[PDB]
Amino acid sequence: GSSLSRTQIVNWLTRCGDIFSTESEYLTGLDREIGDADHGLNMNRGFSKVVEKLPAIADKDIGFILKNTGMTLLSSVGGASGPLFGTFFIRAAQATQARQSLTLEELYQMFRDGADGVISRGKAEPGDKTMCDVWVPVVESLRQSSEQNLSVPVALEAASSIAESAAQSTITMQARKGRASYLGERSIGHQDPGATSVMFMMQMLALAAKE
Amino acid sequence: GSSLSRTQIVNWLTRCGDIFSTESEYLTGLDREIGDADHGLNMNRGFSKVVEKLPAIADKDIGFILKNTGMTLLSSVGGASGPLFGTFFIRAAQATQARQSLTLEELYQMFRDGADGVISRGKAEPGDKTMCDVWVPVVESLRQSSEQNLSVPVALEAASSIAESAAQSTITMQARKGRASYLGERSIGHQDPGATSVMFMMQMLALAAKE
Amino acid sequence: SKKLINDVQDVLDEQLAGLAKAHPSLTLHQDPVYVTRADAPVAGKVALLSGGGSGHEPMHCGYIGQGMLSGACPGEIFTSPTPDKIFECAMQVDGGEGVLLIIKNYTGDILNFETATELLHDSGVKVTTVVIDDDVAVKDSLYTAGRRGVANTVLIEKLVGAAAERGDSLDACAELGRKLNNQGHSIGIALGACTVPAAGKPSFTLADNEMEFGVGIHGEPGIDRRPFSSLDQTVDEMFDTLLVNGSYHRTLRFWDYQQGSWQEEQQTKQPLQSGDRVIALVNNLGATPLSELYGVYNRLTTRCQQAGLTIERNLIGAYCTSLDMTGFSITLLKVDDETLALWDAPVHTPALNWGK
Amino acid sequence: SKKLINDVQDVLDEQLAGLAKAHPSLTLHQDPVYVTRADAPVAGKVALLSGGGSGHEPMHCGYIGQGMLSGACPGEIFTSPTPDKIFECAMQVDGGEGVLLIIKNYTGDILNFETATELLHDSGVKVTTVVIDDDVAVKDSLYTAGRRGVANTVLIEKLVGAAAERGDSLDACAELGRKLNNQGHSIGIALGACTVPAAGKPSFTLADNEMEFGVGIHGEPGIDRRPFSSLDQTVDEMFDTLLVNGSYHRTLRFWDYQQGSWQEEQQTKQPLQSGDRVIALVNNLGATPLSELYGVYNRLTTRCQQAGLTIERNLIGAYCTSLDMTGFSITLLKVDDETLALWDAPVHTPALNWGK
Ligand SMILES: Nc1ncnc2c1ncn2[C@@H]1O[C@H](COP(=O)(O)OP(=O)(O)O)[C@@H](O)[C@H]1O
Ligand SMILES: Nc1ncnc2c1ncn2[C@@H]1O[C@H](COP(=O)(O)OP(=O)(O)O)[C@@H](O)[C@H]1O
Ligand SMILES: [Mg+2]
Ligand SMILES: [Mg+2]
Ligand SMILES: [Mg+2]
Ligand SMILES: [Mg+2]
């Protein structure tokens, strides 16, 4: 049956290291227009540290790897995204726990629990112009894919492609949370940096699950 | 016999007010290249105050008017040119004293004594790149004109025209005194602001003496 | 570009080392980075801690000393520090009487300082919190993250630092900070953007007749871009906004160490009014000449007199910055005789020093 | 353009008014302009006076107070003040024990302060002078106006201000100032020029990889325009120049109040040497971030250690500026225990404040 292995999750996180390095300046520029120009650096610094610690733990259980990842990000990313992405991974790990692979259904639950964590820490609602504008649609994609008994790889391919449109959907919102909310209507016309990071993370998961 | 009247001296100083106002920015730019960009403002502020006090004293003796002028400049121009031009007028006034008009010969002595004052206060030698590079040639012009028994108006016309070439001659000197001497060889290629001020003053005297 | 730095990765390492070298009274800790009074822990006193991104020097490390902070956590440039750094630093400075965390209101500072407060509680450390949200530019908290904590953080760290030193309890410290937070008012403008070391371009560009009005401290654009005309004009718009945006309602959470949980507290601010007495802080955002700040003060005193406000103390200088930003902020904090007594009390920090 | 000013003609009027308003301890006099301690004349002490153009704030008015200056004469921007202002100010502050004039070495300051010294003598006032020429950039006094007085003026005003306050005589004050002048060494660089209020263009332009090396305080170009590469590089060139240009011979004139005449004094400076102890001042020229000054200090301490010099005290901040200039200067003043004792003595000024 269709599942996502522990080494695919390792591979995912490893690809995040690559993407956050490559798109560092792009994310920075997004956070320059409607922020303080640091997001890219924060994500790069965080996943860079994650990906360094990863080879020493590549053989532990999925819950272990995700929880350490969240804790690593927390100790390193800083700013608003550090506690938010840290919480995502920590809550995702307690959905998972000692798994060695994950069914679509468990992936959905994992992402559902992660996002619920970012929503209660940050209180963002749809249209606030945050990473939650990508998480929520992503979770609902996973839910739908699960109903339809899709394979894990095409489920993530569809979640990823939904993440893309959701990130883009932010351009148009006036920010109501985060630093961008201080700019008022000046935040309209600009893509949310954190939502872009979620998009990149989902794009790398689709890649990780292809085989 | 050919003489320079007290009201022509008043007229001279009045024309200096005009020239230092008109050429304020030009003198400023000269003192920007090789200085601190203040000369024009200093001369404008000084002669502006002189020319305000002048109508109340237009009927006193030449020595009186010149000495007050020097004292007014001193209390107002500041920086290096304040004490230097103040001393010029104060020493010129004690050559003059209670005159009501001045012969070529007394003009020469007046300018000779003025300049001697600026030279001993400042110690500038020919080629140091200062106002003294115009004063000294100007005094020697007046001397020569006196030998030749020229009229006062053409004497000043020739002193003025010598002042012009002397000011221009500074472009080429490396400064050895004043603020410009801190720039070393970077002071070469630039006209001395203070020498330009002397030139303007001599040009206005020629004008004042025409009638 | 054009910063006095070496490699971008090493800027904070080099700058913090220089801080520790210059200051015998300060200890630079490593792995994790943070800074403390060399004589912390000080037994018998409430310990005062704060922190935030690098780039606002002297805030906060310039305020570590007797009468002020016991330690501070510098983060990365314009980046809130992480909970482990705040946790270790608070552990290091704990004087048996509790630890007070002063937190500027940014999503990141709030969340990281909150995670840290809970870790401390769970370690048996008595702890509570004060949130600073003095920046009146963001008028309305309804559909925003809330007002920013800017320069008033300094006035509050001093006053609360004085009470902590006087021997006041955690609770009396916290309540003092929260009261002051409720009647302190700030606003900033920028004439030119800062450039972060990793950037080579400024955070925003601006024509010679334009200003960013209602700026904070991390280089984001302000609440609007408007014409710049004169000192008097600029100071008048700022002051008039201190008054019209003075009314503010919002919810701030503080740690109840007895419950062991976050306590929402809905609180409202009044605009400053005729008859109030204030401390005025005229604060360089980084690259404004001191002379111009005095020109700003000249105008501010006039507007204060006209509005019925009496300035009892002032600070004029570079106290809470944004790297190399050309601009300034005005802060007016309402006071009484008891608060003035804490103002005048000794303080011995790199940035602030008097008495004793 | 883009300055926080109103009409150009009124900038100093507005800024000085703001100074007097902010500072209860300072009296602003009019017609002629100058500034004094509100409690001058102080009977029984040598009175310390200085002055110079506006544009170097806080120097000199930020240094008026107990332990430092008794008064100061601000001139126009970058313009030496006139002899009448210095004369009236010295008359105002005369404490029966003499007046000491501290004069930075510029043609204008020298000539105006000299004219003033003579007026004072002729009024029966006991008076003498100290000339400051710490700037090592202009290597050689032979065919120049002489080395400029820059940031070391602050360290000397403090130390001599301490002796004056301790109760030392005019002569012991003067001799102390002149000795310190002989072993204090400064150098400055600019990354960006200042703009004076009347100007709308900066005093010089510069590419991103260029610096003005060996700059003073009035915005003139330095002794050369050279590549800018890094903090370490910049600080290394500056420091190496402090040492190689340390040797200096020149003539400084001081008033002999007994003779009633100028006394030439040919004096020579030694370069700083292995085993000397110093006070280090890392001085913002106006628009450098405090954080970068700490980065500069980090490097400076290394170079000092390597050269055998022990930094005993430091100041890091904006003490002697050039309006909105992006740059900094380094000053190293050689000291002994007796000079350190004067450093640590109380000082109560707007810019400097400790003890007592
Ligand atoms: N209250 C919130 N809830 C969810 N996400 C948020 C919230 N506030 C900010 N964010 C996310 O954080 C991103 C900015 O992160 P970053 O630049 O790293 O932190 P900071 O704003 O402190 O500099 C935003 O683009 C947004 O997606
Ligand atoms: N030692 C000196 N002797 C004669 N003239 C001098 C001397 N030093 C400077 N000057 C004159 O002063 C001019 C600069 O004057 P100004 O800009 O008003 O004063 P400052 O240099 O103090 O700003 C120079 O161009 C030069 O002609
Ligand atoms: Mg950011
Ligand atoms: Mg000049
Ligand atoms: Mg940030
Ligand atoms: Mg000048």
Taking the Cβ of residue C197 and every Cβ of chain A, the question of whether any pair is shorter than 8 Å is answered with no
Which residues, 6 or more positions from C7, have their beta carbon under 8 angstroms from its beta carbon?
A: none
CA atoms of B72 and B53, how far apart (whole Å)? 9
C53 is in an annotated binding site: yes
Instruction: Return the best residue to mutate from B36, B84, B181 for the ligand 2 pocket (most ligand atoms within 8 A of CB).
Output: B84
Least distant ligand from the CA of D76? 6
Q: In angstroms, how far is the first alpha carbon of chain C from the final one?
A: 44
The CA R_g of chain C, rounded to the nearest whole Å, is 19
Chain C residues lying within 8 Å of D192, measured CB to CB: 2
Please answer yes or no on whether B183 and D223 come within 8 Å at the CB atom.
yes
How far is C-alpha C191 from the geometric centre of its chain's CA atoms?
21
Q: Which of B26, B125, B177, B190 to mutate to test the pocket of ligand 2 (most atoms within 8 A of CB)?
A: B177
Q: Could you tell me the domains of chain A?
A: 1-211 (1.25.40.340)
**How is residue C288 written in tokens?**
């404004």
| Angle between the N-to-C axes of helices A24-33 and A39-53, in degrees from 0 to 180, rounded to the nearest 10 | 150
Q: Closest by alpha carbon to C177, among C49, C87, C86, C73?
A: C49
Q: Do the Cβ atoms of D77 and C291 come closer than 8 Å? A: no
Reported structure resolution in angstroms: 2.2
Contact C199 A176 (CB under 8 A): no
- Is D144 in Cβ contact with B176 (below 8 Å)? yes
Give the span between the Cα atoms of D128 and D123, in whole angstroms: 14
- Which candidate in A38, A43, A125 is best for mutational testing of the C interface (most C CBs within 10 A)? A38
- Nearest Cβ partner for B79 among D79, D114, D203: D79
| Collapsed DSSP state (helix, strand, coil) of residue D25 | coil
| Dist. CA B180 → ligand 4 center (Å) | 9
User: Rounded to whole angstroms, how far apart are CA atoms C67 and C154?
Assistant: 12
Name the nearest CA neighbour of C78 among A36, D250, D115, B59. A36
CATH architecture of D184-356: 2-Layer Sandwich (3.30)
**Hunting for tokens 């733990």 — which residue is that?**
A57
How far, in Å, are B22, C318, D78, D249 from residue D18 at the CA level?
33, 16, 19, 42
Contacts of D314 by beta carbon, 8 Å cutoff, 6+ apart:
C22, D279, D280, D281, D282, D297
**Is residue C29 among the annotated active site residues?**
no
**Identity of the amino acid at B132:** C
How far, in Å, is the centroid of ligand 4 from the Cα of B28? 8
List % helix, strand, coil for chain C (3-state, nearest 5).
30, 30, 40
As given in the structure block, the two tokens for residue C301 are 């005193």
The span from the first CA to the last CA of chain A, in angstroms, equals 15
Whether D138 and chain B come into contact, CB under 8 Å, resolves to yes
Q: Which CATH superfamily is domain C11-183 in?
A: Dihydroxyacetone kinase; domain 1 (3.40.50.10440)
User: CB under 8 Å to C49, separation ≥6 — which residues?
Assistant: C69, C70, C71, C72, C73, C86, C89, C90, C93, C99, C100, C101, C102
Q: From CA C82, how far away is CA B18, in angstroms rounded? A: 67
Mutant choice from C294, C299, C315, C325 vs D, greatest count of D C-beta within 10 A: C294
Element (H, E) at C140: none
Q: What angle do CA C2, C5, C10 make, to 5 degrees?
A: 140
Token digits of residue D145: 């106006």
Go through B84-94 and write b for each residue having 16 or more CB atoms within 10 A of its CB, e for each that does not: bbbbbbbbbbe
List every span in chain D annotated with CATH 3.40.50.10440.
11-183
Is the separation of the CB atoms in D333 and D155 below 8 Å? yes
User: Per the CB < 8 Å rule, is B79 touching D77?
Assistant: no
Please state, in angstroms and rounded to a whole number, the distance separating the CA atoms of residues C197 and A36: 13
Q: Which ligand is nearest to the CA of A136?
A: 1
User: Cα(B89) to centroid of ligand 6, in Å?
Assistant: 21
Q: Is the dihedral of CA D324, D332, B179, D11 positive or negative?
A: positive
Going by C-beta distance under 8 Å and a sequence separation of 6 or more, which residues neighbour residue A60?
none
DSSP string computed for B22-85:
HTHHHHHHHHHHTS-S-HHHHHHHHHHHHHHHSGGGTTS-HHHHHHHHHHHHHTTT-TTHHHHH
Question: How many Cβ atoms sit within 10 Å of the Cβ of residue A168?
Answer: 15
Residue D89, SS3 per DSSP: helix
Q: Residue C50, annotated ligand binder?
A: no
Per the DSSP assignment, residues forming a β-bridge with C36 are C27, C71
Neighbors of chain C with 3 or more C-beta pairs under 8 Å: A, D
**Rg of chain B, C-alpha, whole Å:** 16
Atom 16 of ligand 2: nearest residue by CA position: B39
Angle, vertex CA A67, rays to CA A65 and CA A72, nearest 5: 90
DSSP-based three-state secondary structure for B106: helix
> For chain D, where do the domains classified as CATH 3.30.1180.20 start and end?
184-356
Contact list in B for residue D114 (CB cut-off 8 A) is: 83
- Going by C-alpha positions, the residue among B21, B68, B28, B22 that lies closest to residue B47 is B21
Question: Rounded to whole angstroms, how far apart are CA atoms D48 and D72?
Answer: 9
Helix, strand, or coil (residue A202): helix
Give the tokens for residue A67: 């929880």
Q: Neighbouring chains of B at 3+ CB pairs within 8 Å?
A: D
B153 lines ligand 2 (CB under 6 A): no
Is the CB of C231 less than 8 angstroms away from the CB of D287?
no
Going from the C-alpha of A125 to that of each of A63, A121, A160, the distances in angstroms are 28, 12, 21
Distance CA C19, CA C28 (A): 8
**The ligand 2 atom nearest the CA atom of B131:** 27
Name the strand (E) or helix (H) holding A101: strand A101-103
Instruction: Point out the residue among D1, D3, D291 whose CB comes nearest to the CB of C57.
Output: D291
β-pairing verdict for C47-54 and C99-104: parallel
Q: Is C308 exposed, middle or buried (0-12, 13-18, 19+ CB in 10 A)?
A: exposed
Q: Please give the C-alpha separations between residue B171 and each of A72, B30, C204, in angstroms, as whole numbers.
A: 67, 10, 43
Judge if the beta carbon of residue D107 lies within 6 A of ligand 2. yes
Compute the distance between CA of residue D203 and CA of residue B79 in angstroms, rounded to an integer.
18
Rounded Cα distance, C296 and D4, in Å: 8
Q: Which backbone phi and psi does C56 adopt, to 5 degrees?
A: -115, 15
